[PDB]
Design an enzyme around this catalytic site. Sequence first.
Site, PDB file in Angstrom:
ATOM      1  CD  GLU A   1       2.175 -11.695  -4.890  1.00 29.35           C
ATOM      2  OE1 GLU A   1       1.643 -11.631  -3.755  1.00 29.35           O
ATOM      3  OE2 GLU A   1       3.005 -12.649  -4.999  1.00 29.35           O
TER       4      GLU A   1
ATOM      5  CG  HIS B   1      -2.186 -13.939  -2.898  1.00 32.73           C
ATOM      6  ND1 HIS B   1      -1.606 -12.729  -2.663  1.00 32.73           N
ATOM      7  CD2 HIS B   1      -2.946 -14.180  -2.086  1.00 32.73           C
ATOM      8  CE1 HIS B   1      -2.380 -12.194  -1.819  1.00 32.73           C
ATOM      9  NE2 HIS B   1      -2.894 -13.224  -1.057  1.00 32.73           N
TER      10      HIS B   1
ATOM     11  CE1 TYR C   1      -1.444  -4.791   0.357  1.00 34.43           C
ATOM     12  CE2 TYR C   1       0.670  -4.365   1.293  1.00 34.43           C
ATOM     13  CZ  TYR C   1      -0.490  -5.298   1.205  1.00 34.43           C
ATOM     14  OH  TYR C   1      -0.377  -6.567   1.777  1.00 34.43           O
TER      15      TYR C   1
ATOM     16  CD  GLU D   1      -1.457  -7.582  -5.647  1.00 37.64           C
ATOM     17  OE1 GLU D   1      -1.673  -8.781  -6.395  1.00 37.64           O
ATOM     18  OE2 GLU D   1      -2.054  -6.865  -5.137  1.00 37.64           O
TER      19      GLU D   1
END
Length: 115
Positions: free
Chosen positions: A47, A56, A95, A99
Amino acid sequence: PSKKNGRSGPQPHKRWVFTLNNPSEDERKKIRDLPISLFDYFIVGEEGNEEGRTPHLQGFANFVKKQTFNKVKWYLGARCHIEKAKGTDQQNKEYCSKEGNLLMECGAPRSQGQR
């Protein structure tokens, strides 16, 4: 150094996530170079779509066996913050992909079962 482990409060599971701020090429390479056979499901996503800010790391890995938080740190390392994951295979897979950037794609779509 001696430690005592058991089944008090928190217990080991077959699902654990990892997250680290401003991941290094060494750390990212270590996790990305981890044994796929060790985890029935391995999905990592990067991300970093914000200029001026550092990248990140955020991904999920399904442990083939039962492991504890402290124990799991033997692979994910203490440097990276780990937590218990929740949801279906799609919830975890999506999930990490949320990103918009995938860092690693391996393993199978491990889903929960109970009905």
